[PDB]
Amino acid sequence: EPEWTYPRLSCPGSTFQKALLISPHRFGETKGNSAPLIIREPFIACGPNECKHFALTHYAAQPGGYYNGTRGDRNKLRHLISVKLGKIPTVENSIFHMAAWSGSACHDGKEWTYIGVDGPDNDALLKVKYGEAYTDTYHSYANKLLRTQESACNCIGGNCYLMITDGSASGVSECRFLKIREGRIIKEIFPTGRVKHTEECTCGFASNKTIECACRDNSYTAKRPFVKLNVETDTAEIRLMCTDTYLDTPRPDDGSITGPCESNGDKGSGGIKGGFVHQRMESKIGRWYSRTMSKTERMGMGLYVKYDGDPWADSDALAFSGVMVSMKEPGWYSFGFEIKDKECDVPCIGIEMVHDGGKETWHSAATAIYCLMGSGQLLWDTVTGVDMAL
Amino acid sequence: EPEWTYPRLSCPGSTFQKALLISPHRFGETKGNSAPLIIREPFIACGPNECKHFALTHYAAQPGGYYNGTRGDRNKLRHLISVKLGKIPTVENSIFHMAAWSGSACHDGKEWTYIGVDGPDNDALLKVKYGEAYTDTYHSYANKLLRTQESACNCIGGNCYLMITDGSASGVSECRFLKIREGRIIKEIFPTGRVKHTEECTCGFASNKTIECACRDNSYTAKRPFVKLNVETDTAEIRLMCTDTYLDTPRPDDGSITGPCESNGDKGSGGIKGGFVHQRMESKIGRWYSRTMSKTERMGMGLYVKYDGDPWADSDALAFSGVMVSMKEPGWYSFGFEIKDKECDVPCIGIEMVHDGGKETWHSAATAIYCLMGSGQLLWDTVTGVDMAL
Amino acid sequence: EPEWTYPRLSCPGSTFQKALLISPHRFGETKGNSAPLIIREPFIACGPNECKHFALTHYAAQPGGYYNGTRGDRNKLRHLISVKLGKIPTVENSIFHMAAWSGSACHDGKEWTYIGVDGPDNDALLKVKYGEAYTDTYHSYANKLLRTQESACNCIGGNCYLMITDGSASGVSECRFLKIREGRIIKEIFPTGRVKHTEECTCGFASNKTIECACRDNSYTAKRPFVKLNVETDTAEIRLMCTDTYLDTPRPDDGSITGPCESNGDKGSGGIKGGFVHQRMESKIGRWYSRTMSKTERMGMGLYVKYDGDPWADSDALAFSGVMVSMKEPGWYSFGFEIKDKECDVPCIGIEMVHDGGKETWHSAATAIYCLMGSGQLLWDTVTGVDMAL
Amino acid sequence: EPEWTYPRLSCPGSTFQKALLISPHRFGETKGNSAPLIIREPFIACGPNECKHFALTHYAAQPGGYYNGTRGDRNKLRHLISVKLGKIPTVENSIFHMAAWSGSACHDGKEWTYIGVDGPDNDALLKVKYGEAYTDTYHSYANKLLRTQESACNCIGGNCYLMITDGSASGVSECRFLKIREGRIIKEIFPTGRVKHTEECTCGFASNKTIECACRDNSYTAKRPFVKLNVETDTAEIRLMCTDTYLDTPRPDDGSITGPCESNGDKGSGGIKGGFVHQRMESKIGRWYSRTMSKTERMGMGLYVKYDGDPWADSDALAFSGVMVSMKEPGWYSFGFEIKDKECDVPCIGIEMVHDGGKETWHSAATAIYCLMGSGQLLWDTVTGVDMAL
Ligand SMILES: *[C@@H]1O[C@H](CO)[C@@H](O[C@@H]2O[C@H](CO)[C@@H](O[C@@H]3O[C@H](CO)[C@@H](O)[C@H](O)[C@@H]3O)[C@H](O)[C@H]2NC(C)=O)[C@H](O)[C@H]1NC(C)=O
Ligand SMILES: *[C@@H]1O[C@H](CO)[C@@H](O[C@@H]2O[C@H](CO)[C@@H](O[C@@H]3O[C@H](CO)[C@@H](O)[C@H](O)[C@@H]3O)[C@H](O)[C@H]2NC(C)=O)[C@H](O)[C@H]1NC(C)=O
Ligand SMILES: *[C@@H]1O[C@H](CO)[C@@H](O[C@@H]2O[C@H](CO)[C@@H](O[C@@H]3O[C@H](CO)[C@@H](O)[C@H](O)[C@@H]3O)[C@H](O)[C@H]2NC(C)=O)[C@H](O)[C@H]1NC(C)=O
Ligand SMILES: *[C@@H]1O[C@H](CO)[C@@H](O[C@@H]2O[C@H](CO)[C@@H](O)[C@H](O)[C@H]2NC(C)=O)[C@H](O)[C@H]1NC(C)=O
Ligand SMILES: CC(=O)N[C@H]1[C@H]([C@H](O)[C@H](O)CO)OC(C(=O)O)=C[C@@H]1NC(=N)N
Ligand SMILES: CC(=O)N[C@H]1[C@H]([C@H](O)[C@H](O)CO)OC(C(=O)O)=C[C@@H]1NC(=N)N
Ligand SMILES: CC(=O)N[C@H]1[C@H]([C@H](O)[C@H](O)CO)OC(C(=O)O)=C[C@@H]1NC(=N)N
Ligand SMILES: CC(=O)N[C@H]1[C@H]([C@H](O)[C@H](O)CO)OC(C(=O)O)=C[C@@H]1NC(=N)N
Ligand SMILES: *[C@@H]1O[C@H](CO)[C@@H](O)[C@H](O)[C@H]1NC(C)=O
Ligand SMILES: *[C@@H]1O[C@H](CO)[C@@H](O)[C@H](O)[C@H]1NC(C)=O
Ligand SMILES: *[C@@H]1O[C@H](CO)[C@@H](O)[C@H](O)[C@H]1NC(C)=O
Ligand SMILES: [Ca+2]
Ligand SMILES: [Ca+2]
Ligand SMILES: [Ca+2]
Ligand SMILES: [Ca+2]
C-alpha cells in the first residue's frame, strides 16, 4: 500500500559512469521500418517502482512528411509524451499525456503529477494532471511567456514543488514556485534576493528541509542563478553561483568575471539548461553539475562536482570529473534525476543530444544517462551514432 | 473487489481548456512507417482506473489499399475498437471488441459493457458484451435502421442506461431506452412527450435521480430533443430544448425560430451529434454544450454553458465560452464524458475532426479533448495538422 | 488462491449471431506498414479471465519474402502462436509458444497447457507445455504421422483431455486420448467401438460426466465419427454420427447413405475439421454443428443444431440455423469453444477463413466468430474483405 | 512476500527435444514492415514467473542503414537488451537495460540483476543494476580486457555468483568470481588450481552447495576449463575437463591429446562459448553439454551428456545425444538455463545461430532452444530459415 515518498540518503559511490543511451533516431532511416517520435526537451522522472522518460513531441515521426516546423519551440500540436525508461519512444510505444510546449512531471509516492504549459505566448496556461485527471491550471502573470522547468519537479511527503517563470527572454523573468498537493495548487511562493531573471530551474533535495536549483539566466549572466527553497517555511531566496567554473552557455573564461560573487560579467546573453543533482551523505553534501565543453556552442558535455560549502559564497572552481559527451558530439539541455533503489537514492544526470541540421530537415534529440556508480573516475563518453542524411 | 460506481460532485472549476489531441493520421503519410486505423464516430468512456478511446473502424489502415467504401456508414467489416486514451489507435495498439456499425460502451465500476449494432438495414441487431462474453441482443422494432448513441452509456448502481432508436432518417424515429445490468437487458423504457424523432443522444447524469440527453433530430427541427430520464422510476420524457442558441447542424439564425418553445421551426432536415456534459455542484447544475461554428457546414466547434433552469422552458441564449475548433478546421460529431479524479468527477467534451477529401480517398477522423480545468477563459483552439495529400 | 474449472450450464439464448471478425490480412498490403503473420489451423481457448487466439504460423509475415512453402502442412519453421482474442496477430503482438505443425491448448483454471506436435513424419513428437515450462512428451505409436486436435482441449477438475491419432491419411488411424494434469500425461485412453479412423476431433462438455467429440474420417465415410468419453471412469467409445445431415466435406447428398447407422457409405475420402459445441441446460442439451455450404469445396459455412437425443442412433436431419459464411466466401476448418461469463458459459463456433491463391502466393487465414446470442434467428454473414492482389 | 530461490531437483526426463526457435530476421526482409534488432551473444535467464531473452544489440535494426560495424565486438553503442522469451526482439518489443559490449543477468527470486561491462579496452568497467537502479561497479584488474559470461549468473539464497575475467586473449586470462547481493558485490572469490586461461563460463547449480562452470580457453587448449565453486565456503577450484570429447571449437580429433588428464594438447588457439546445464536427480547428477558439428568452424551443434563421476578425472567420451543444428547450418555460442516449473526445474540449452555474410552487410543471430522433455531420443534439428539476401 502506497505511502508518500521522501528524499533518502544517496547510495554509496564517488564517481559517475556512462549508464544508458536512448537514441530513437538510430531506427529513423528511410531504409527502416520504425517510427521514432520527433522530440526535444527530454527529461526523466522516477517513482518507487518505475522510471519514466519524458519529452515534448512535435507530433511527427522520422521518417515522415511533417519536418517543417520541428525547429520551432511552440505550436498547437506539441504534446508531453513518455515511455518507461529503456523503451524507444515511438508512435506506438509512447503515451500522450496532454498538449504542451513546456513541461514537467514527478511522482509523489502514490501517483504521477504531469505538468504542461500551452496556449498563446501573451497568455499561456499551465495545466496540472494527477494520473488520468486534469485537476488545476495556473495563469500567466507577466503576460510575456509563462513557462516551466523541462525537468522533474520535487515531491516530499505529498507536497510537490515546481518552478515557473514569466517574462522576457532578453529582459526580466521573475520566477515563482507552485506547491502542488494531489494535483491541486495549494500555495504560491515568491522568492527574494537576486530575482531579475530565473528560468528552466533544475531542482533537487539537499535534505528534508531544503530544495536547491541551478537555473538559467538568458540575458544578464553566464553564472547560474541558484535557488534555495525551504520546504518547512515555504520560502525561497535566489543568489548567483559564486564558483569560477561558470556553468551556462554561452559563458566567458573560468574566473575571468572579476569582483564580488554577485557580479554579472560578460557574455550573459543567451543560455542553456543545466544538469544538477545532489549526493546526500550522513555528514556532507555533494553537488554535481554539467556544462557544455564549448564556451559558446552547444557542443560536448562535461561533468563537475563539489562537496559542501555555500554555492552563493564560494569562488572555488568545481572539480572536473570527466567527459560525458566529447566536443565533437552535440550536447544541449541537461537535467538531474534520482532512481529509487531498495533503501537508497541514486543520483543521475541526463543529457539532451540534439540532432541539428537546420530548418530544412528534421530536428530531434537523443538522451544519454550518467549515474553515480561505484568508485574511481568517469571512463567513457557517449555518441548518438545517427547519420542525419539517412 | 470493486463497488458499483455512482455519479459524484464535479471537481472544482469554471472554464474548459484544451487538454489533448489524438491525431493518428499525422503518422499516416506514405514515407512514414505507421498504421493508424481508419475510423469514424469516436467517443470516450472512463472507468475508475482507465479512460478508453473508442471508435468504429472500417477495418483498414492508412496507408493501405482499402480506402474505397470508408465514406459509407455501414458494411460487414465495421467493428468497435478501443485503445487506452493517450495511445494512438493503430492496427497493433487497438483491440477489436465486436462487429458493429453503431456503438456505445460504459463502465459500471466492475466491468466494461460494450454495445455494437450490426446486420441488414431492414433487420439490424444490437449486441451486448460484458467483459469478454457476449451476453444479450435486441431486435429491430421498426425495421428501418436500429442504431444507438455513438457515445458512452451511463451506469449507476450496476444499471446501465442506453438510448436506442429505429426509424427513417427523414421521418419518424421513436427512441427507447434499455436498462442493462451485467450485460443483460432487464427493462425497456418508452419515453413520452415529443417522440417524433430522437437519435444519437449524448447522455449524462444531472444527479443521482436524473439522466439528461441532448439528442439529434434529423428530420423535423434544428432544436435538440432533450430527454429527462428518471432512474429511480425508469420513466423518460422528451421535449425540445427551448434555448435561442440552436445546437444542431444545420440550423437557422439564433433565436430566429418564432413562436413558443415547442415550435419546430425551419431547417429541420439533417443533423449532427452534439457534445453535452454536466457539471454537478452542491447547489447548482452546469450544462455544457458544443456546436459547429458554421451554421450549415460541419466546420468549427464552439463551447457553450448555462447553469440550472429548465432546458425545456428557457429561451435564454446560452453563454459562449470559447472556440475549441476554428471554422478553418473540420468539426463533426461531439460527445460528453467524465474522467474520474480520486474524490470527484471531471467533465469533458470530445470533438471528432473528420479528414474529408471525398469518395476518392480515405475517410477518417482525429479526436480533440477539452475539460473543465481551473478558472478564467478558454485559451486555445485545436487543429489536426494533417495534410491528406501525404 | 485459484481453483480448477468445471463445465457450467450454458447461458440463456436460442440463436447464434455474428460476433467478431479477425482478419489480419486486411492490413497486409504492399502499400501498408503492418506485419500480419501467415497462419493456418487457428482456434480459440478461454480461461476464467481472458480468451486466447491460437494458430500455427509459418514464421513468415505478409508482406514478406518467404511465401514459398506456406501452403504446406509440416516443416521445421512452424510454431504455435497466440494473442489475446481481439488483437491482430502480427509479428510484434504474437507470442511464440513452441515449435509445432499440429497444436492444441486449454486452461484448467490455474494455468494454460500448450500442446505442440513436430518432428519427422514417421517419428513425430507431441510436446506439452505448462505455463513457461516444457513438461512432457508423447511418441508416435504407428510411425505414420502423430497429430492432434487443432482446437481446444478440455479440462475438468484439473484433468485435461486431448485427442491424438497416428496413421495414414487414406487408411487406418486409431486415435487415443491423453489425460493430462499440470503438464503431465497421467493416463492413456484407448477408445472401443468404431475406431478404424478418427482425427481432428472437436470436443466439448456434454456434462460433468461426459465429453463428446465431433471428429473427422479422412478415408472411410462422410459421416463424422462421434466420441463419447466418460471422464469419471476414463473410457471412450466411438460410433459414426447417424444423422442424414452429413457434416464432412466432401460429402454425398444428405440422407443418401443407404443402410443402418454404422454404414460407411460413399464419398468417404477427403474431409475437414468441423465446429461443434454444447449448449448445456438443466432441462436439455443442445448440440450446434457447422459444415461448408458446398458439398465438394471448402466454401461457405452453415450452422446446424439438434436438441437432445443420441447422435449414434438418431438418423434425423439437423435443424438449419443460418448461413455464417456465404458460399461465395472461403470456409475451412471450424472449431467450438466457450467463453466464460461470470456465472454462465457461452458457446461459440469459430471459422477459419483461408485466403487461398494457390501455392504461387501467400497462404493464410482470417477467423470469424459466432456465439449463442439472444433469441430469434441468425441475421448476418461474414466476409474477409481481403483482396490477395494487394 | 517473495522468498529467495534455490536450485530444486530437476524435472523427470531422459532426453532433450526441440522446444522453440526465435528467428527475428525471418521478418527482416526489405519488402517487409518489421524491425528486428541486430544482435549477438544472446542468452536466457528465468525467474519464478517469467523467462527473459537477453542479447547485446549494435543499436541498429534490419532493414536499416547502420550495418557497418555490426560484425564488430565492441563500441560505444552496444547495449544489453531483452524481451520476454517468446517475443520477437524488435526495436519496439525490446527494453534497453544499459550500455554494454559484454553482459549477464539473473533473478534471485525477488528482483532481477543485470550485468553490463563497457568502457575502453584497457580500463574496462563492469556495471551492476538491480531492478531500475545502478548499484555497483568493478574495475579492470589486468588492464587488458575486462569481460564476463554472456550467459546467466546464478542465485542461491539471494547470493548471486558471477564469473568475470581480464587479461590477454592469446595469453593469460585469470578469472575471478563475484558474490553479488541485492545489486552489490559483497565478496570476491579467487579460484585455485588450473587458472592460466578461463573465460565465458557457463555456470549452473549441481547442488545447494556446488556451482559448476564449463568455460572457454582461447589460447592454450581445446579442453574446457571446469570450475567447481563451493557456495557454503565461498571457494572455487578450476581443472580442465578430461573427457576425450573436446567441446571447444577449433579442436583436434577426439582423444588425440595424448597424456594424463591435465595435458593441454594441440589446436588450443581460438575458442567458443559452450553449452552446459545440470540435470539434478535424487542420487544422481546429469551433465549435458553442447559443441559444434565442425571441428574447425562455427557450424552445426550437437548435444552430449554424461551421468555422475568426476569431469576432472574421467577421460571417457560423452554420450552423443543428438544433432540440434546440422553442419549445414550456423552454430555459434551456446548456453545453459533452467525454467522453473511448479515444483521442479527444467534444464535447457540455447544456441546462437549467427547469420554471417561478411563485413559489408548486417551481422546478427537467431536463438534456438532445446529442453529436457520426456523419453527416447532427440528427434529434430533446427534451421533459421533466413535468406540473407532478402
Ligand atoms: C527524510 O525524512 C524521512 C521520513 O522521516 C526519512 O526516512 C525515514 O527514516 C528512516 C530512513 O532510514 C526509516 O527508518 C527505518 O524504519 C524501517 C521501518 O519502517 C526499518 O526497516 C529500518 O531499519 C529503519 O529503522 C524510516 O522508516 C523513514 N520513514 C519514512 C516515512 O520513510 C529520511 O531518512 C529523511 N532523509 C534524510 C534525513 O536525508
Ligand atoms: C449518488 O449516490 C451515491 C450512492 O450513495 C453517492 O455515493 C456516496 O457518496 C458519499 C459522499 O458523497 C460517500 O461517503 C464517503 O465515504 C468515504 C469512504 O468510502 C468516507 O471516507 C467519506 O467521509 C464519506 O463518508 C459514499 O461512500 C458514497 N457511496 C457510494 C456507494 O459510492 C454519491 O455521493 C451521490 N452523488 C451525488 C449526490 O451527487
Ligand atoms: C459440474 O459440477 C460442478 C461442481 O464443481 C458445478 O459447479 C457448481 O455449480 C453450482 C451452480 O449452482 C455452484 O453453486 C453456486 O455457488 C455460489 C458460490 O459463490 C453461490 O453464490 C450460488 O448461489 C450457487 O449456489 C457451485 O459453486 C459450483 N461449484 C464450484 C466448485 O464452482 C457445475 O455447475 C456442474 N455443471 C453442470 C451442472 O452443468
Ligand atoms: C536445497 O535447498 C532448498 C532450500 O531449502 C530446498 O527447497 C525446499 O524444498 C522442499 C521440498 O524438498 C520444500 O518443502 C521447501 O519449502 C523448500 N524450501 C525453500 C526455502 O524453498 C531444496 O529442496 C534443497 N535441495 C535440493 C535442491 O536438492
Ligand atoms: C517555453 C519555451 O519556448 N522554452 C524554450 C527556451 C526559451 O526560448 C528560452 O529559454 C528563453 O526564454 O529555450 C529553448 C532552447 O533550446 O534554448 C528551448 C525551449 N523550447 C521549449 N521548451 N519548447
Ligand atoms: C447507423 C448509421 O449509419 N448512423 C450514421 C448517421 C445516421 O445516418 C443519422 O443518425 C440519421 O439517421 O449519420 C452520421 C453522420 O455522419 O451524419 C453517420 C452515422 N454512421 C454510423 N454510425 N456508422
Ligand atoms: C498434422 C497435419 O498435417 N494435419 C493436416 C491435415 C491432414 O493432412 C489430414 O487431416 C489427413 O490426416 O489436413 C489438412 C487440411 O487442411 O485438410 C491440414 C492439416 N495441416 C496441419 N495441421 N499442419
Ligand atoms: C568481450 C568480448 O569482446 N568477447 C568476444 C569474444 C572474445 O574476443 C574472445 O572470447 C577472446 O577473449 O569473442 C566472441 C566470439 O564471437 O568469438 C565474441 C565476443 N564479443 C562480445 N562479447 N561483444
Ligand atoms: C468501390 O466499390 C464500389 C462498390 O463495390 C464499386 O462500384 C466501385 O467501382 C469501387 N471503386 C473503385 C475505384 O474501385
Ligand atoms: C521452395 O521450397 C522448397 C522446399 O524445400 C525448396 O526445395 C525450394 O528450393 C524453394 N524455392 C525457393 C525459390 O525458395
Ligand atoms: C565503416 O566505418 C569505418 C570507420 O569506422 C570506415 O573507415 C569504413 O569505410 C566504413 N565502411 C563503409 C562500407 O562505409
Ligand atoms: Ca546566460
Ligand atoms: Ca436537424
Ligand atoms: Ca470423410
Ligand atoms: Ca581453445
Residue numbers in the entry:
A (entry chain F), B (entry chain E), C (entry chain G), D (entry chain H): 76 to 465
Question: What does the literature reporting this entry say, word for word?
Answer:
The neuraminidase inhibitors (NAIs) oseltamivir and zanamivir are the antiviral agents available in France to treat influenza A or B virus infections. The NA active site includes catalytic residues (R118, D151, R152, R224, E276, R292, R371, and Y406; N2 numbering) that interact directly with the sialic acid substrate and framework residues (E119, R156, W178, S179, D/N198, I222, E227, H274, E277, N294, and E425; N2 numbering) that stabilize the active site. NAs are divided into 3 phylogenic groups: influenza B viruses, group 1 (N1, N4, N5, and N8), and group 2 (N2, N3, N6, N7, and N9) from influenza A viruses. I221 (B NA numbering), I222 (N2 numbering), and I223 (N1 numbering) amino acids are highly conserved framework residues in NAs of influenza viruses.
We are the first to report influenza B viruses, isolated from an immunocompromised patient after prolonged oseltamivir treatment, with good fitness carrying a novel I221L substitution (B numbering) in NA that confers high-level resistance to oseltamivir. We used X-ray crystallography to understand the structural basis of resistance to oseltamivir conferred by NA carrying the I221L substitution. Crystals of the NA-I221L protein in complex with both inhibitors diffracted to high resolution, showing clearly defined density for bound oseltamivir and zanamivir. Consistent with lower levels of inhibition of the I221L mutant virus by zanamivir, no marked changes in the conformation of zanamivir were seen. Viruses isolated from an NPA collected on D34 and a nasal swab specimen collected on D40 were highly resistant to oseltamivir (IC50, 1515 and 1776 nM, respectively) and showed reduced inhibition by zanamivir (IC50, 24.3 and 27.3 nM, respectively), compared with the first wild-type isolate. The Km revealed that the I221L NA variant had a 1.9 times lower affinity for the MUNANA substrate, and the Ki values for oseltamivir carboxylate and zanamivir showed affinities that were around 84 and 51 times lower, respectively, than that for wild-type NA.
